[PDB]
Amino acid sequence: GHMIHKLADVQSKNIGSGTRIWQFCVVLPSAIIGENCNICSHCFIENDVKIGNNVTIKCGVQIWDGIEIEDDVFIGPNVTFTNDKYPRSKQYPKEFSKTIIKKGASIGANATILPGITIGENAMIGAGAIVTKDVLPHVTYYSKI
Amino acid sequence: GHMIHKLADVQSKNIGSGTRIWQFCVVLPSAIIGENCNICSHCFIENDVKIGNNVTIKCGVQIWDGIEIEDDVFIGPNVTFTNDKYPRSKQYPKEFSKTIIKKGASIGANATILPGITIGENAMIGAGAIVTKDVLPHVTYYSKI
Amino acid sequence: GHMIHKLADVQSKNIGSGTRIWQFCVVLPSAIIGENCNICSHCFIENDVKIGNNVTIKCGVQIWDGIEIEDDVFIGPNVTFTNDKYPRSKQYPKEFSKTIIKKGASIGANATILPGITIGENAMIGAGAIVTKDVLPHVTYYSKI
Ligand SMILES: CC(C)(COP(=O)(O)OP(=O)(O)OC[C@H]1O[C@@H](n2cnc3c(N)ncnc32)[C@H](O)[C@@H]1OP(=O)(O)O)[C@@H](O)C(=O)NCCC(=O)NCCS
Numbered sequence: 195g196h197m198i199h200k201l202a203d204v205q206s207k208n209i210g211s212g213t214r215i216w217q218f219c220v221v222l223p224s225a226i227i228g229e230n231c232n233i234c235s236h237c238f239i240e241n242d243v244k245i246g247n248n249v250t251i252k253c254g255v256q257i258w259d260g261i262e263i264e265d266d267v268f269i270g271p272n273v274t275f276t277n278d279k280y281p282r283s284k285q286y287p288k289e290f291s292k293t294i295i296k297k298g299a300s301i302g303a304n305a306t307i308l309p310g311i312t313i314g315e316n317a318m319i320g321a322g323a324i325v326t327k328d329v330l331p332h333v334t335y336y337s338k339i
Numbered sequence: 340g341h342m343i344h345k346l347a348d349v350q351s352k353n354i355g356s357g358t359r360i361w362q363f364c365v366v367l368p369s370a371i372i373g374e375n376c377n378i379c380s381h382c383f384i385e386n387d388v389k390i391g392n393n394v395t396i397k398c399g400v401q402i403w404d405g406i407e408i409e410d411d412v413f414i415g416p417n418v419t420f421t422n423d424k425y426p427r428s429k430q431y432p433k434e435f436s437k438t439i440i441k442k443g444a445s446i447g448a449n450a451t452i453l454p455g456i457t458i459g460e461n462a463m464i465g466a467g468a469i470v471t472k473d474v475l476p477h478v479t480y481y482s483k484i
Numbered sequence: 485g486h487m488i489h490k491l492a493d494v495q496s497k498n499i500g501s502g503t504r505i506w507q508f509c510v511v512l513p514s515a516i517i518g519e520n521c522n523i524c525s526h527c528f529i530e531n532d533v534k535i536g537n538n539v540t541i542k543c544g545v546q547i548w549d550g551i552e553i554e555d556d557v558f559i560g561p562n563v564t565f566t567n568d569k570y571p572r573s574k575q576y577p578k579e580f581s582k583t584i585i586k587k588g589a590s591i592g593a594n595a596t597i598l599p600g601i602t603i604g605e606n607a608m609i610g611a612g613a614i615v616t617k618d619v620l621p622h623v624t625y626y627s628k629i
């Protein structure tokens with residue numbers, strides 16, 4: 195089975211065995227979540243979303259439509275994803291940009307990921323980084339201070 | 340009418356027709372919100388706050404006392420506002436700094452807005468930007484990496 | 485007494501007189517919180533956590549295992565802490581890195597604090613800063629744009 199906290203609003207039935215979803219999470223009906231994930235408190239997970247197995251999503255993360263997370267990915271707290279490069283209120287694009295975070299990659303706390311981004315397998319994104327371009331497999335990327 | 344999610348704590352009656360306020364939002368009594376706004380999950384909206392019509396506020400946004408949002412504004416997820424330039428615990432200023440986000444402006448995901456800031460009409464703030472000075476109407480501003 | 489909002493999940497009994505804990509907070513059993521703290525909405529507070537007296541924690545803050553906050557500290561909204569320098573999903577270190585935020589220090593909104601960091605007494609961390617090294621007592625530190 196999976197553990198859905200009574201204080202979460204989980205509307206998806208597509209949740210793998212051993213997955214925990216914690217307090218004050220919202221998960222919309224079409225979200226797919228694999229086995230042995232940890233979805234920590236205060237996350238939002240939209241409809242057009244696929245999350246693999248053994249994925250850690252720390253508190254305060256929103257996963258928008260068009261975002262895929264592969265197996266064994268770590269997403270740090272307050273990591274921010276985007277799917278609309280030039281957002282204007284009530285101006286809905288035909289297609290949202292797709293982001294993919296590839297197997298085993300890690301995104302540091304409070305990093306910001308621009309639309310249409312690929313983060314390669316086993317990459318490491320520094321805490322607080324702004325990711326405006328694809329990060330290659332196994333690369334450590336951070337924003338200079 | 341307006342839609343207030345049963346899992347929100349909305350204490351304001353000042354909410355325009357067609358406005359949606361989603362799960363785990365807090366809205367204090369004196370907040371004014373216009374028509375056809377979307378206040379996504381996990382937002383906080385204080386008392387001395389005015390939000391216009393057709394405003395999109397994505398997840399994880401707090402709008403403090405002294406902040407005005409004009410019509411047609413887009414606020415990206417996890418955008419952070421401030422109203423106290425030199426904060427010390429339990430040291431309350433006589434007046435909070437005022438921020439105004441002007442008609443049609445857009446603030447990218449996880450941007451940070453310093454106190455007393457004006458963001459001009461139709462401006463575009465890059466995701467993850469730190470805004471330490473006013474942004475002119477129609478200007479695209481982002482922090483260099 | 486202390487005020488625990490009915491919409492918070494506070495599991496700790498170790499909460500000082502005059503402390504307020506607001507909506508959609510999670511506080512795990514072993515957390516220690518002093519007197520006259522304000523824990524604003526949408527915070528997460530883990531087990532191996534000590535918070536002193538008169539501490540302000542604004543919305544959207546997570547305090548992980550290994551983090552101590554001394555008296556009179558101000559933590560801005562959406563400040564992000566970390567306790568694992570090279571995070572990989574399901575790879576648990578023997579010891580989490582310890583962070584200490586020393587008496588009277590202030591951390592600006594949406595700042596990011598790397599693991600093992602000391603922020604000295606009465607320091608001021610700029611909004612949106614990335615803190616990769618200890619900040620000395622009474623120093624104002626911010627990330628250049
Ligand atoms: C990116 C990271 C892996 C760097 O590790 P590293 O390659 O060992 O880097 P170092 O610690 O040797 O630092 C090298 C330099 O980059 C800087 N730097 C390190 N991490 C940085 C970051 N995230 N942003 C900006 N600069 C950073 C250091 O200040 C140092 O600068 P210097 O050479 O001028 O002294 C690490 O700092 C990090 O960000 N880890 C993620 C932590 C996290 O978010 N955990 C998840 C929540 S628990």
Ligand SMILES: CC(C)(COP(=O)(O)OP(=O)(O)OC[C@H]1O[C@@H](n2cnc3c(N)ncnc32)[C@H](O)[C@@H]1OP(=O)(O)O)[C@@H](O)C(=O)NCCC(=O)NCCS
Binds near residue numbers: 275276415
């Ligand atoms: C700011 C923004 C509009 C820039 O669009 P643009 O003017 O087309 O910019 P470009 O994509 O041409 O990039 C120009 C340069 O600025 C950099 N850049 C772009 N956006 C940046 C940002 N937010 N922060 C830092 N650098 C940024 C690019 O890396 C590029 O650098 P280069 O010239 O060295 O290659 C866009 O990148 C952005 O941030 N959009 C907001 C996304 C968002 O938050 N959506 C809301 C949630 S869905």
Ligand SMILES: CC(C)(COP(=O)(O)OP(=O)(O)OC[C@H]1O[C@@H](n2cnc3c(N)ncnc32)[C@H](O)[C@@H]1OP(=O)(O)O)[C@@H](O)C(=O)NCCC(=O)NCCS
Binds near residue numbers: 454472560591612625
């Ligand atoms: C860091 C801070 C205290 C700086 O105050 P200060 O020392 O008076 O700095 P100034 O306003 O004189 O700015 C000096 C320069 O640093 C820049 N700067 C200021 N704060 C900055 C920040 N947080 N990040 C990056 N640059 C910053 C300014 O743009 C200015 O650049 P310039 O010299 O090129 O014009 C203040 O800007 C700040 O970040 N306050 C925290 C606000 C907050 O988070 N409040 C909590 C929530 S209410």
Ligand SMILES: Cc1cn([C@H]2C[C@H](O)[C@@H](COP(=O)(O)OP(=O)(O)O[C@H]3O[C@H](C)[C@@H](O)[C@H](N)[C@H]3O)O2)c(=O)[nH]c1=O
Binds near residue numbers: 233566567
């Ligand atoms: C009991 C409880 C837990 N949680 C979440 C938030 C908390 O940190 C986490 C603990 O589960 P875990 O499996 O021990 O930890 P997790 O894998 O998420 O993260 C930990 O390990 C990794 C490797 C570190 O990088 C990370 N910084 C740690 O927090 O689960 C909640 O969100 N609510 C809860 O009530």
Ligand SMILES: Cc1cn([C@H]2C[C@H](O)[C@@H](COP(=O)(O)OP(=O)(O)O[C@H]3O[C@H](C)[C@@H](O)[C@H](N)[C@H]3O)O2)c(=O)[nH]c1=O
Binds near residue numbers: 240278361362377395
């Ligand atoms: C069903 C549901 C929705 N929401 C919020 C969060 C979700 O993304 C949003 C969907 O409503 P929308 O009107 O389709 O989308 P919105 O206008 O907010 O944003 C979308 O369109 C803009 C133009 C894009 O830039 C943006 N990135 C998109 O998310 O409403 C919640 O917070 N909880 C919910 O249960």
Ligand SMILES: Cc1cn([C@H]2C[C@H](O)[C@@H](COP(=O)(O)OP(=O)(O)O[C@H]3O[C@H](C)[C@@H](O)[C@H](N)[C@H]3O)O2)c(=O)[nH]c1=O
Binds near residue numbers: 403423427429
């Ligand atoms: C009524 C209510 C309040 N709160 C929190 C969030 C809100 O901003 C705060 C008000 O309490 P306060 O003691 O007046 O304010 P606080 O000390 O936290 O912060 C204020 O003063 C400091 C000095 C400023 O730097 C800061 N920017 C201010 O918000 O308490 C909630 O989280 N939920 C609530 O329902």
Ligand code: NA
Binds near residue numbers: 272304417449562594
């Ligand atoms: Na943030």
